[model samples]
Target: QTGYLTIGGQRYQAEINDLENLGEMGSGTCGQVWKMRFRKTGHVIAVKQMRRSGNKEENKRILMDLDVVLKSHDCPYIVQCFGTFITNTDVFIAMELMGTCAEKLKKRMQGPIPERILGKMTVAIVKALYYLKEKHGVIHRDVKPSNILLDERGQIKLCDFGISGRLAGCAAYMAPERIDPPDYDIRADVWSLGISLVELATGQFPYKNCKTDFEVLTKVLQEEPPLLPGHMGFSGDFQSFVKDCLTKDHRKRPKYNKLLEHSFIKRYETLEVDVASWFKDVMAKTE
Candidate 1:
């Protein structure tokens, strides 16, 4: 029953309503993302609720579709946004839902996630970044696991664009150039991906000792990007992918699209397992 929705006369579809708030997913400067459902249809979705108070993008736009600088596209690895509804003082964004994400899952595990699962998650994100960079002409500046979610069906979707370098996100995940010269590019995302993957792989954020802005600048910028230990049982392919991302020189960083063809992802290109089963088993044990 999902159908067309009109926003700025984009001639789009994916309109839904009778939206019941199941719970809050997270919040940002723009609004709160909630786990929601269509009351009568029982269709599950995420709703980003924001006040349409200013000329900010969402006030008149949405999703990456609202990047105010995007081309409508379909990146399976990227989270899907259904449509938007504008109210007198608010804007509601409808989007897809996921079972969980690597950040919370890793925290519950209290250690590095299994490389088997991590490989798929990282690859999906790489593809997501590839599309965003190649097609959308934008930088995710805020690429982090918290923003990357996975569904029960082995689906990984990237979210939380409100703070991407173009606008916002975590300072830890930012590239040195972004923090230094206030510069950016698609490569910034690669560096952020490098940090996030290492943090997940070793259960330690890179530069965990840095407690101040100056420290972050000194450590993250002056030195080479952190390295993944070859002793961690990580395959050479996986380790190589990580090092490629942490390359201080953005020019040397692997392009998102090209990274899709990397050996790390290629090795696991056919690995298959029940994501839903894994999700349930992990949560059951942790709970």
Candidate 2:
């Protein structure tokens, strides 16, 4: 299937015959994700094609895992997978197209968002994590800003499951005991979620000062994260929620349902922010 098109120095001939590459969206260590157009359906989809020698088993595992995760679950906050396709050189997984990722948006926001807006994003993400944990039995080992996408309605969508593990080797987000000899369970995701919440509140990584991924992982595994900023206007209850999620003892972390009951998230549900009202003001200043 190398007869039709070339993108990012790789030749790809569409096996489906109807899918066309629009352009590259982002590139990662594993592969390039493209913005693709489906001619037959008039739909825009994000197509992730694994790199050469990318291990078909790993790609298949991600495909199956996503199928299981999205099955019987539907929410505005979870990215939806459309389908998967196989070609000569790569396995392509197509998913719903979403707007900018949280990382970019956070930068655009200049600094930490107002409590009201932060709460809304936090609640939406927490609910999605809850659904994945309680109902799906999946662990999203990587829960960074780049993995969270926002739609036009200001809703959040959790994306990317390539490094996610069901039972083990989720060291980036794993507890010390879990990162040691024995494999851990889905609770590791909760720890990462806590880190994510901190990022949302601060617009910075919890351990941004770390020199390397290994160093960051070691810090997470060895020491407790520092106290969250006191001036974000976050309630004590919200602060407590952050602590619970970042617990070094994975077993002590609150379950998703219990997390949903927290006052921080509940408050977000009732509060609303008018993003449109401040758009012009923000653009004029930033531009």
Candidate 3:
């Protein structure tokens, strides 16, 4: 079947023959991910293939979500979308290939991530979220460890933009406002980022022993938000940053701009952080 793809500013009138499926990357929110070669350039890239849904409305939503990815090439901290291929049976979105996700990495590490690495991660996620909000008029509704990725180069990026609608992802990471209902915005993402950080730092989900989704949502709404334990010996600035993110009232929650100005965010910007070497070390140890 015929397809089309864009790389940089050029568009290729492509066909199924123009690409070669290399192997599986993993399954993402709505599709199977594969390592594919764009034969036109002989470049290896990742592709997410979502089969066309029988429902017209669902199909339309898939296109709308892919539109966001297509327009996101300019944002460095977001996974770069090269372009897409459409067939009668499925849609293929070509993108940059990152090594692994934060969730998987955390599992391999089998322990808390160093604060410095988290500092670097925080900067990347905040900037990506801020860019989506300010430039694209989009809020990343599904912000979590699995959605945060790291490349072999040590670059951190946010992925899975197709689920940027609804309260549809991990219930445990949802902001209280998201769980409680009514209007919510980027602050909801801030809350998710905080929870994600807490999980990575402590090596587990903050809400423990919950048997069901309802129980998890109950704790998120009715209990004090989780924090970086004082016993963990994290910096006061990091603690305060997370506290601000988890503020129960959406009105009181700091927006991305406020978060950008935070000392913790600024610290990583000025300080030289070599997360790439750390990532390499981690991968070497596990492999």
Candidate 4:
């Protein structure tokens, strides 16, 4: 189980015959991500392929990540690790293939998303964060639309735990304490969540106008968190929801449990969502 991969409760070789290497996906500090196809199933999958050092702790990190995803298998909002494999020099983890990320999806939408759909997407993510905080004592150091993925069928799940650790993740979505922390908790995620929605709502990142990392952090600390301009005509509830998530003080931030009950989220989550078609169609325009 440590190095071998199992499909259908059985161990199998990820041979060229069994899998088709679609190509490279993305790379960051840890390693690269790849796209592959399971030949027998004709199903597409995303593989997080990390280059490994021979050190014990270096190898332990991937296993711990695998363990976290596996234990949280009950969560539909979190991405599922179908299985994992290891070579002498690298490790690969296969997960459900999402059509694209929320950031790309937002770009494809060409403007701010409707209040109802935005509410649905936000609620799904909120539920996942709630579960992680409650069950694993984990805080997804990064919490943005780009880290969230959407399937053609409109299934949304969180991915990319590459930089998740104590005092880790991108500075743009971070709370004031992120790059450097003073007892930061799961609520740190709430701040990022708000910033993510701000991106989707305005079709641009809140910090996009800022020229540098220092400026981004300065805005987060000194300026009010962004809001969709009043002229966009979004609902009052949506406006208030974003405000609640961005509440500067982590202690004052809304926990997932409380946020789940917010009128905006509760109203939209139970409704039939059309964002799946929106995601599929939007992805069609990209490379």
Task: Please report the candidate that would top lDDT against the real structure.
Answer: 3
Each candidate structure's count of clashing pairs:
4, 0, 0, 1
Candidate 1 lDDT for residue 218? 78
Residue 178 lDDT, candidate 2, scale 0-100: 54
Better of 1 and 4 by lDDT: 4
Cα lDDT computed for each candidate against the true fold? 0.70, 0.65, 0.82, 0.74
lDDT of 4 by residue, 196-269 (tens): 88888788777777878788888788877777567888888889899998888777887788898888887887
Q: Give the per-residue lDDT digits (tens) of candidate 3, residues 113-136.
A: 999999999999999988887788
TM-score for each candidate, following the candidate numbering: 0.82, 0.75, 0.88, 0.86
Write one digit per residue (lDDT tens) for candidate 2, span 1-287. 22233332343444456788888886442356788886754657677776557777666656654565457346667876666666676667666545767666677877775666556777877777767666666666677677777665565677766565445433444455556536455566677667767876887776767766578678876676645788867789778878887777667767778888888878778877764444334445562
User: Residue 55 of candidate 4: its Cα lDDT?
Assistant: 55
Model 4 / residue 135 / CA error / Å: 0.7
Q: Model 4: which residue pairs collide? A: 154-276
lDDT value, residue 219 of candidate 1? 77
lDDT of 2: 0.65
Cand. 3 Cα-lDDT: 0.82
The segments of candidate 4 whose C-alpha lies over 4 angstroms from its true place after superposition are 2-17, 27-30, 53-64, 165-167, 179-183
TM-score of 4: 0.86
